Amino acid sequence: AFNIFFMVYFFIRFIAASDKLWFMLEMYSFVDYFTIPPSFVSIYLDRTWIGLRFLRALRLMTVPDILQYLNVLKTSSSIRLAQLVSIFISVWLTAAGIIHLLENSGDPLDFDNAHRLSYWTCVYFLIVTMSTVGYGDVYCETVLGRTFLVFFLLVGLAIFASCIPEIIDLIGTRAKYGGTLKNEKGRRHIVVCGHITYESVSHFLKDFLHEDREDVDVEVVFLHRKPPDLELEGLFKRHFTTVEFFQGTIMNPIDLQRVKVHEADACLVLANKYCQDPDAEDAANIMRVISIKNYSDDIRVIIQLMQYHNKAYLLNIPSWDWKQGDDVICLAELKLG
């Protein structure tokens, strides 16, 4: 009865097929031609067999398509991985049906070397074959069945090594720096932004995390746009308990939320001493303070400034208060002073 409105269902595909010839070998139509006549088989001789109806498992490859219709998996990335698992299950199940048929029926010549195998065993047979484990407790005995194992392993390995090594490998790779800063009860921390290099961070960490400093625990959060290099990565490893790095920009409001600016005690901005244009570096550093002050008014900001004449620009910020704790460290004025 299910096939009654399925073999007329194929008619609507065949009646108005755009390609009258290329539609002959289409994957979904190919299965039906081997399953529709079996429907007529059980009506003229009163005898039914296992048949090729196990090929209906190939309809599972359309299952992810309906999931798009129901909006279960809206993202395209999830759809692509949902595709591959659909063929994997469909191929695994339809091959077990072939194994079940090629073993229980037996060879057409002698019809005596038939081994009783269950479909629950056939799926267990192939799952350990694909994993290349090979327990050997269950194995194929029919000559025709043995020929399939030789072919299907050969075509299966080639198919496995044709798409998975190129598209599955891309999905696995992901970034290692990111995510919201971990929160702790009674956690005091500061945010350091600006120029983040080895010989600049190390000097600051020597004094801030000094050996003889009396016991106060303040975490240090570094927010730099570029990922750290190997020279600086080792420095963070030696201070893993008190120093954490996050990839982002202090100018991005989203990245400000990631480092929990409003929870920070103070914000520190470092200046690039080796810059061709000190005025350009100072302008960028000052503009970082504006972003921090815009996000939170009552935040303490300490900035390294290259030139003395750029101090006046920081006074133009309405939220900049020297009495509240904001302070400017001018390298040129202090060094030559």
Added chain:
Amino acid sequence: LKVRKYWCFLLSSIFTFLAGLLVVLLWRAFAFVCTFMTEAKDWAGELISGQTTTGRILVVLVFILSIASLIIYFVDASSEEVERCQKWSNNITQQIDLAFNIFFMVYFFIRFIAASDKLWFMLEMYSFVDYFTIPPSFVSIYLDRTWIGLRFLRALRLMTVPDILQYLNVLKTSSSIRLAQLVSIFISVWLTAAGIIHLLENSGDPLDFDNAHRLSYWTCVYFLIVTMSTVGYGDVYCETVLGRTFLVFFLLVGLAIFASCIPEIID
């Protein structure tokens, strides 16, 4: 074995596991429209954020004795019987496992009483194991019969072992800690899966209860070590239908898990 009795033992595990599903979800959300607070601050440091003695002392007695609980589980794991009956008065180890769990099932209370998340804490990995092992403690007290149980899940406590190593400063470097993490899950998953294999094979299928193959825990660990390496000697293999279903699932999820983190961080 007169009649099956592990079904109600698991039902008791089901009762307590689903008890949190009912006692918590029915009461928490009613107070929004219109002690717990003090002890939570201590418990956060008493269990997790302990530096010198608030957390370390409590942590030491939960994983060392869990390993001891695993050790005393091995002596009954090596036993041929899966559900044996014995007088629980003065056995060699029947008193200790219950006694160890006596201050473990009230230990879970301090986690549950002052849990920051009343609902999200239901499925946490360490709390998930207890809900399937705490009611088994009550199992052996009302019918005088003890079985293999789900106490093999205590092997998942080995994933906390590297955390204590940080407390004792055995592995100071962060790089050594990261690799020490991965080996901890690898051993914990390997041992806990062997316990499932031991239970799914010795107990047998619930329907017929005749196709049960005698397998030892020493054999089960050897069974999976060659399966993970994809060698497959075949000298030992699973015969139970339920056990065979696990091999199909665990290889599939194991290969996906193996190919999800090792290729990116181990490399």
